[PDB]
Amino acid sequence: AMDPEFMREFQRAAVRLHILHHAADNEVHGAWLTQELSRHGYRVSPGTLYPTLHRLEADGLLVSEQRVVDGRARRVYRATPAGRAALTEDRRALEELAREVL
Amino acid sequence: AMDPEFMREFQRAAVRLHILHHAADNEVHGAWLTQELSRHGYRVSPGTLYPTLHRLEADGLLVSEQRVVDGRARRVYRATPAGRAALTEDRRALEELAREVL
Numbered sequence: 001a002m003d004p005e006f007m008r009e010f011q012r013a014a015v016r017l018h019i020l021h022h023a024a025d026n027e028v029h030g031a032w033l034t035q036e037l038s039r040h041g042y043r044v045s046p047g048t049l050y051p052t053l054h055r056l057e058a059d060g061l062l063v064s065e066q067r068v069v070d071g072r073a074r075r076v077y078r079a080t081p082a083g084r085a086a087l088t089e090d091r092r093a094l095e096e097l098a099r100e101v102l
Numbered sequence: 103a104m105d106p107e108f109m110r111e112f113q114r115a116a117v118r119l120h121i122l123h124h125a126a127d128n129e130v131h132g133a134w135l136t137q138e139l140s141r142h143g144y145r146v147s148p149g150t151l152y153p154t155l156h157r158l159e160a161d162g163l164l165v166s167e168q169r170v171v172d173g174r175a176r177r178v179y180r181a182t183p184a185g186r187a188a189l190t191e192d193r194r195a196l197e198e199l200a201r202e203v204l
Protein backbone atom coordinates (compact mmCIF):
# COMPACT_ATOMS: atom_id res chain seq x y z
CA ALA A 1 0.00 0.00 0.00
CA MET A 2 1.36 3.45 -0.89
CA ASP A 3 -0.67 4.98 2.00
CA PRO A 4 -0.94 2.50 4.92
CA GLU A 5 -2.26 5.15 7.31
CA PHE A 6 -5.24 5.92 5.01
CA MET A 7 -5.81 2.15 4.58
CA ARG A 8 -5.78 1.51 8.32
CA GLU A 9 -8.24 4.27 9.21
CA PHE A 10 -10.46 3.54 6.19
CA GLN A 11 -10.50 -0.19 6.93
CA ARG A 12 -11.66 0.42 10.54
CA ALA A 13 -14.50 2.51 9.18
CA ALA A 14 -15.27 -0.04 6.43
CA VAL A 15 -15.40 -2.95 8.87
CA ARG A 16 -17.79 -1.09 11.18
CA LEU A 17 -20.04 -0.22 8.25
CA HIS A 18 -19.99 -3.81 6.90
CA ILE A 19 -20.95 -5.17 10.28
CA LEU A 20 -23.99 -2.88 10.51
CA HIS A 21 -24.91 -3.62 6.87
CA HIS A 22 -24.96 -7.37 7.53
CA ALA A 23 -26.58 -7.18 10.96
CA ALA A 24 -29.42 -5.00 9.66
CA ASP A 25 -30.23 -7.58 7.05
CA ASN A 26 -30.15 -10.60 9.34
CA GLU A 27 -28.79 -12.14 12.56
CA VAL A 28 -25.08 -12.95 12.38
CA HIS A 29 -22.40 -14.85 14.29
CA GLY A 30 -18.92 -13.43 14.67
CA ALA A 31 -17.40 -16.50 12.98
CA TRP A 32 -19.49 -15.87 9.88
CA LEU A 33 -18.70 -12.14 9.86
CA THR A 34 -14.98 -12.95 9.87
CA GLN A 35 -15.50 -15.09 6.74
CA GLU A 36 -17.80 -12.56 5.01
CA LEU A 37 -15.45 -9.64 5.67
CA SER A 38 -12.56 -11.79 4.41
CA ARG A 39 -14.51 -12.63 1.21
CA HIS A 40 -14.78 -8.87 0.59
CA GLY A 41 -10.97 -8.38 0.95
CA TYR A 42 -10.80 -7.09 4.56
CA ARG A 43 -8.01 -8.52 6.70
CA VAL A 44 -9.73 -9.35 9.99
CA SER A 45 -9.33 -12.05 12.62
CA PRO A 46 -11.59 -13.17 15.49
CA GLY A 47 -9.08 -11.37 17.81
CA THR A 48 -9.81 -7.97 16.12
CA LEU A 49 -13.43 -8.54 15.12
CA TYR A 50 -15.00 -9.72 18.40
CA PRO A 51 -13.83 -6.59 20.29
CA THR A 52 -15.43 -4.40 17.54
CA LEU A 53 -18.67 -6.37 17.88
CA HIS A 54 -18.62 -5.85 21.62
CA ARG A 55 -17.96 -2.11 21.18
CA LEU A 56 -20.82 -1.82 18.65
CA GLU A 57 -23.16 -3.35 21.25
CA ALA A 58 -21.80 -1.00 23.97
CA ASP A 59 -22.48 1.88 21.53
CA GLY A 60 -26.12 0.68 21.33
CA LEU A 61 -25.89 -0.10 17.62
CA LEU A 62 -26.02 -3.90 17.92
CA VAL A 63 -27.83 -6.15 20.36
CA SER A 64 -26.69 -9.70 20.97
CA GLU A 65 -28.55 -12.76 22.21
CA GLN A 66 -26.98 -15.91 23.60
CA ARG A 67 -28.78 -18.96 22.26
CA VAL A 68 -28.36 -22.67 22.84
CA VAL A 69 -29.04 -24.31 19.48
CA ASP A 70 -28.32 -27.95 18.74
CA GLY A 71 -26.49 -28.36 22.09
CA ARG A 72 -24.09 -25.43 21.51
CA ALA A 73 -24.22 -21.93 23.09
CA ARG A 74 -23.59 -19.19 20.55
CA ARG A 75 -24.05 -15.48 20.41
CA VAL A 76 -25.91 -13.81 17.54
CA TYR A 77 -25.89 -10.06 16.76
CA ARG A 78 -28.47 -7.89 15.10
CA ALA A 79 -28.79 -4.18 14.45
CA THR A 80 -30.90 -2.17 16.85
CA PRO A 81 -33.10 0.73 15.76
CA ALA A 82 -30.13 3.04 16.68
CA GLY A 83 -27.89 0.83 14.49
CA ARG A 84 -30.21 1.11 11.51
CA ALA A 85 -30.22 4.91 11.93
CA ALA A 86 -26.40 4.83 12.19
CA LEU A 87 -26.19 2.67 9.07
CA THR A 88 -28.17 5.31 7.15
CA GLU A 89 -25.93 8.15 8.38
CA ASP A 90 -22.69 6.21 7.81
CA ARG A 91 -23.78 5.27 4.30
CA ARG A 92 -24.74 8.88 3.60
CA ALA A 93 -21.33 10.08 4.63
CA LEU A 94 -19.74 7.42 2.35
CA GLU A 95 -22.00 8.34 -0.58
CA GLU A 96 -21.11 12.01 -0.20
CA LEU A 97 -17.36 11.44 -0.20
CA ALA A 98 -17.69 9.11 -3.22
CA ARG A 99 -19.73 11.82 -5.07
CA GLU A 100 -17.20 14.52 -4.19
CA VAL A 101 -13.91 12.86 -5.18
CA LEU A 102 -14.87 10.27 -7.88
CA ALA B 103 -24.25 11.53 14.99
CA MET B 104 -25.65 8.06 15.74
CA ASP B 105 -22.19 6.48 15.26
CA PRO B 106 -19.47 8.91 16.44
CA GLU B 107 -16.73 6.27 16.22
CA PHE B 108 -17.48 5.59 12.52
CA MET B 109 -17.59 9.36 11.89
CA ARG B 110 -14.25 9.91 13.61
CA GLU B 111 -12.39 7.15 11.74
CA PHE B 112 -14.08 7.94 8.40
CA GLN B 113 -13.37 11.67 8.74
CA ARG B 114 -9.64 11.08 9.39
CA ALA B 115 -9.50 8.99 6.25
CA ALA B 116 -11.56 11.52 4.26
CA VAL B 117 -9.36 14.42 5.29
CA ARG B 118 -6.22 12.54 4.25
CA LEU B 119 -7.80 11.75 0.88
CA HIS B 120 -8.85 15.39 0.39
CA ILE B 121 -5.39 16.62 1.19
CA LEU B 122 -3.79 14.38 -1.49
CA HIS B 123 -6.56 15.34 -3.94
CA HIS B 124 -5.82 19.07 -3.43
CA ALA B 125 -2.03 18.67 -3.39
CA ALA B 126 -2.09 16.68 -6.65
CA ASP B 127 -4.09 19.41 -8.34
CA ASN B 128 -2.00 22.31 -7.09
CA GLU B 129 0.49 23.59 -4.51
CA VAL B 130 -1.16 24.34 -1.15
CA HIS B 131 -0.55 26.26 2.06
CA GLY B 132 -1.80 24.77 5.31
CA ALA B 133 -3.98 27.82 6.03
CA TRP B 134 -5.82 27.32 2.75
CA LEU B 135 -6.29 23.58 3.35
CA THR B 136 -7.87 24.41 6.71
CA GLN B 137 -10.39 26.68 4.93
CA GLU B 138 -11.09 24.23 2.10
CA LEU B 139 -11.60 21.25 4.41
CA SER B 140 -13.81 23.41 6.67
CA ARG B 141 -15.93 24.48 3.67
CA HIS B 142 -16.57 20.80 2.96
CA GLY B 143 -17.78 20.15 6.56
CA TYR B 144 -14.61 18.61 8.05
CA ARG B 145 -13.70 19.72 11.54
CA VAL B 146 -10.01 20.55 11.16
CA SER B 147 -7.73 22.84 13.09
CA PRO B 148 -4.01 23.67 12.74
CA GLY B 149 -3.47 21.24 15.70
CA THR B 150 -4.86 18.28 13.65
CA LEU B 151 -3.85 19.36 10.16
CA TYR B 152 -0.13 20.16 10.52
CA PRO B 153 0.72 16.76 12.10
CA THR B 154 -1.05 14.97 9.21
CA LEU B 155 0.82 17.10 6.66
CA HIS B 156 4.08 16.23 8.40
CA ARG B 157 3.26 12.49 8.40
CA LEU B 158 2.24 12.59 4.73
CA GLU B 159 5.64 14.08 3.90
CA ALA B 160 7.44 11.51 6.11
CA ASP B 161 5.56 8.83 4.18
CA GLY B 162 6.93 10.30 0.91
CA LEU B 163 3.44 11.25 -0.33
CA LEU B 164 3.91 15.00 -0.05
CA VAL B 165 6.95 17.22 -0.39
CA SER B 166 7.13 20.68 1.11
CA GLU B 167 9.27 23.63 0.18
CA GLN B 168 9.93 26.77 2.19
CA ARG B 169 9.67 29.51 -0.41
CA VAL B 170 10.20 33.24 -0.32
CA VAL B 171 7.65 35.01 -2.48
CA ASP B 172 6.92 38.72 -2.36
CA GLY B 173 9.35 39.06 0.61
CA ARG B 174 7.52 36.50 2.78
CA ALA B 175 8.68 32.95 3.63
CA ARG B 176 5.97 30.32 3.47
CA ARG B 177 5.79 26.56 3.34
CA VAL B 178 3.96 25.04 0.37
CA TYR B 179 3.02 21.35 -0.09
CA ARG B 180 2.55 19.28 -3.20
CA ALA B 181 1.97 15.64 -4.00
CA THR B 182 4.90 13.52 -5.06
CA PRO B 183 4.63 10.81 -7.70
CA ALA B 184 4.18 8.32 -4.76
CA GLY B 185 1.36 10.60 -3.47
CA ARG B 186 -0.41 10.52 -6.82
CA ALA B 187 -0.19 6.71 -6.82
CA ALA B 188 -1.52 6.70 -3.21
CA LEU B 189 -4.41 8.96 -4.23
CA THR B 190 -5.36 6.37 -6.88
CA GLU B 191 -5.20 3.48 -4.38
CA ASP B 192 -7.14 5.42 -1.72
CA ARG B 193 -9.82 6.26 -4.32
CA ARG B 194 -10.01 2.61 -5.30
CA ALA B 195 -10.62 1.62 -1.70
CA LEU B 196 -13.41 4.23 -1.52
CA GLU B 197 -14.97 2.96 -4.76
CA GLU B 198 -14.94 -0.60 -3.46
CA LEU B 199 -16.70 0.25 -0.19
CA ALA B 200 -19.31 2.27 -2.09
CA ARG B 201 -20.01 -0.83 -4.30
CA GLU B 202 -20.25 -3.14 -1.33
CA VAL B 203 -22.60 -1.26 1.00
CA LEU B 204 -24.65 1.08 -1.29
Ligand SMILES: [Cl-]
Binds near residue numbers: 004005
Ligand atom coordinates in the same frame (compact mmCIF):
# COMPACT_ATOMS: atom_id res chain seq x y z
CL1 LIG C 1 1.83 4.35 8.69
Ligand SMILES: [Cl-]
Binds near residue numbers: 030050053
Ligand atom coordinates in the same frame (compact mmCIF):
# COMPACT_ATOMS: atom_id res chain seq x y z
CL1 LIG D 1 -19.07 -12.97 20.67
